[PDB]
Amino acid sequence: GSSGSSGVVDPSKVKIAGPGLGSGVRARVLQSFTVDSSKAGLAPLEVRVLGPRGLVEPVNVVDNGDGTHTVTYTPSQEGPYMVSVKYADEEIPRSPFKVKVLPTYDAS
């Protein structure tokens, strides 16, 4: 049951689950995931994508309305990318995120 009166922000309660963060990512492909911060509080969510060499790519942020956030992006190229995420000026315990992008073409 719901009991207690507190309004603190817990950046350690926010998580993310989606294909965009998985290992099955391909370059020049639509990558998106879900950011659950309902247990974190009412704090904002920040995101950042850093290329393998040190490139800077933009990110999308959309509020679901229930208790999550959708972030769409597209890795111009492949390689060891890095998707950092913050919450209320506090780098979540799950960030940064090591996402190794793969070449649209699979060398079988």
Curated annotation (Swiss-Prot):
Residue positions where Phosphoserine is found in the record: S23, S95
Spell out the residue ranges that the record assigns to Filamin repeats: 8-101
Found, by tissue, as follows: Ubiquitous. Isoform 1 and isoform 2 are expressed in placenta, bone marrow, brain, umbilical vein endothelial cells (HUVEC), retina and skeletal muscle. Isoform 1 is predominantly expressed in prostate, uterus, liver, thyroid, stomach, lymph node, small intestine, spleen, skeletal muscle, kidney, placenta, pancreas, heart, lung, platelets, endothelial cells, megakaryocytic and erythroleukemic cell lines. Isoform 2 is predominantly expressed in spinal cord, platelet and Daudi cells.
What processing steps or modifications follow its translation? ISGylation prevents ability to interact with the upstream activators of the JNK cascade and inhibits IFNA-induced JNK signaling. Ubiquitination by a SCF-like complex containing ASB2 isoform 1 leads to proteasomal degradation which promotes muscle differentiation.
Q: Which disease is it linked to?
A: Interaction with FLNA may compensate for dysfunctional FLNA homodimer in the periventricular nodular heterotopia (PVNH) disorder.
Task performed by this protein: Connects cell membrane constituents to the actin cytoskeleton. May promote orthogonal branching of actin filaments and links actin filaments to membrane glycoproteins. Anchors various transmembrane proteins to the actin cytoskeleton. Interaction with FLNA may allow neuroblast migration from the ventricular zone into the cortical plate. Various interactions and localizations of isoforms affect myotube morphology and myogenesis. Isoform 6 accelerates muscle differentiation in vitro.
Q: How does it assemble?
A: Homodimer. Interacts with MICALL2. Interacts with RFLNA and RFLNB. Isoform 1 interacts with FBLP1, FLNA, FLNC, GP1BA, INPPL1, ITGB1A, PSEN1 and PSEN2. Isoform 3 interacts with ITGB1A, ITGB1D, ITGB3 and ITGB6. Interacts with MYOT and MYOZ1. Interacts with HBV capsid protein. Interacts with ASB2 isoform 1; the interaction targets FLNB for proteasomal degradation.
How does the record comment on the protein's domains?
Comprised of a NH2-terminal actin-binding domain, 24 internally homologous repeats and two hinge regions. Repeat 24 and the second hinge domain are important for dimer formation. The first hinge region prevents binding to ITGA and ITGB subunits.
Q: In which family does this protein belong, per the annotation? A: Belongs to the filamin family.
Kindly provide the name given to this protein in its UniProt entry. Filamin-B
Give the organism, scientific name.
Homo sapiens (Human)
**Which taxonomic lineage does the organism of this UniProt entry have?**
Eukaryota, Metazoa, Chordata, Craniata, Vertebrata
